[PDB]
Amino acid sequence: SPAMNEMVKERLVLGAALKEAISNNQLKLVYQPQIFAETGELYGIEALARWHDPLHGHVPPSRFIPLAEEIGEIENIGRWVIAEACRQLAEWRSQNIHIPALSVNLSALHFRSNQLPNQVSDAMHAWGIDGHQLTVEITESMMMEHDTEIFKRIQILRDMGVGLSVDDFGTGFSGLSRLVSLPVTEIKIDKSFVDRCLTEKRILALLEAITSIGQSLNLTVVAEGVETKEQFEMLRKIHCRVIQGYFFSRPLPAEEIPGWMSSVLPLKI
Numbered sequence: 608s609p610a611m612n613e614m615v616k617e618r619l620v621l622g623a624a625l626k627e628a629i630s631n632n633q634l635k636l637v638y639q640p641q642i643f644a645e646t647g648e649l650y651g652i653e654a655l656a657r658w659h660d661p662l663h664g665h666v667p668p669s670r671f672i673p674l675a676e677e678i679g680e681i682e683n684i685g686r687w688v689i690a691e692a693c694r695q696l697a698e699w700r701s702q703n704i705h706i707p708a709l710s711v712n713l714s715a716l717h718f719r720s721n722q723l724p725n726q727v728s729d730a731m732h733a734w735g736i737d738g739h740q741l742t743v744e745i746t747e748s749m750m751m752e753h754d755t756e757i758f759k760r761i762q763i764l765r766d767m768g769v770g771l772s773v774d775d776f777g778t779g780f781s782g783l784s785r786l787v788s789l790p791v792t793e794i795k796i797d798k799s800f801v802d803r804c805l806t807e808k809r810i811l812a813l814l815e816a817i818t819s820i821g822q823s824l825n826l827t828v829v830a831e832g833v834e835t836k837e838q839f840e841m842l843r844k845i846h847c848r849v850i851q852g853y854f855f856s857r858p859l860p861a862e863e864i865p866g867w868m869s870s871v872l873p874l875k876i
Contacts, residue, residue, distance in 0.1 A: 639858035641851035644843045647875030651708035654692045681717045686726045693734040714746035720755035742770030798832025815845040
């Protein structure tokens with residue numbers, strides 16, 4: 608009972624603290640560099656929420672994203688992330704060409720079908736983003752027909768230069784056959800797939816098959832969740848194109864990014 612009283616108490620203070628966080632704009636945006644395996648040069652970065660508060664603390668995204676879902680703040684957060692990212696690109700535009708591409712995981716931000724054509728376009732209009740600078744990532748579950756009228760929404764963005772990426776495959780050839788009929792520009796590999804891909808058998812051949820589709824259709828296969836050297840060796844051997852994980856660099860905040868790109872690049876191993 609007092610555990611129950613503590614859960615309600617704690618999930619009521621943080622809820623009000625989350626509303627205050629978006630009101631005065633406390634939220635941050637930490638980026639994680641993804642580079643080429645053979646070249647070592649930077650391919651792009653991914654914008655991550657990473658809320659930080661003096662009282663509560665580090666408050667991981669996996670614990671406030673569902674929390675923001677019950678209080679209806681997924682639109683306020685989602686719109687903000689894109690808007691802040693474009694603002695950060697504008698701040699970086701006043702230096703040089705800098706960033707090649709910037710990725711945003713819409714699925715992780717719990718994006719509904721109503722936000723796509725506007726929250727991306729309006730951020731590209733308020734700032735000098737040429738469109739061929741940012742890419743979006745969806746869970747493919749939204750890709751299916753339904754009745755949400757989302758197929759033309761992503762096509763609007765794709766005509767502006769915005770890249771597209773999918774994540775969930777469900778470990779199935781049907782998911783691969785449904786993928787080749789999709790207007791994608793890059794393909795991401797789940798962390799669970801990369802995790803212990805050396806142990807299991809088919810999962811290594813599966814990842815080797817995904818990379819085969821990439822070279823044939825000019826798709827950029829993206830590795831996500833690489834930690835050890837052994838994972839890099841096997842992936843590079845099967846031509847994984849690009850890598851993203853703790854093995855290269857832990858996600859860095861908005862600041863120190865130019866200092867990182869000028870000191871460690873090219874990171875060729």
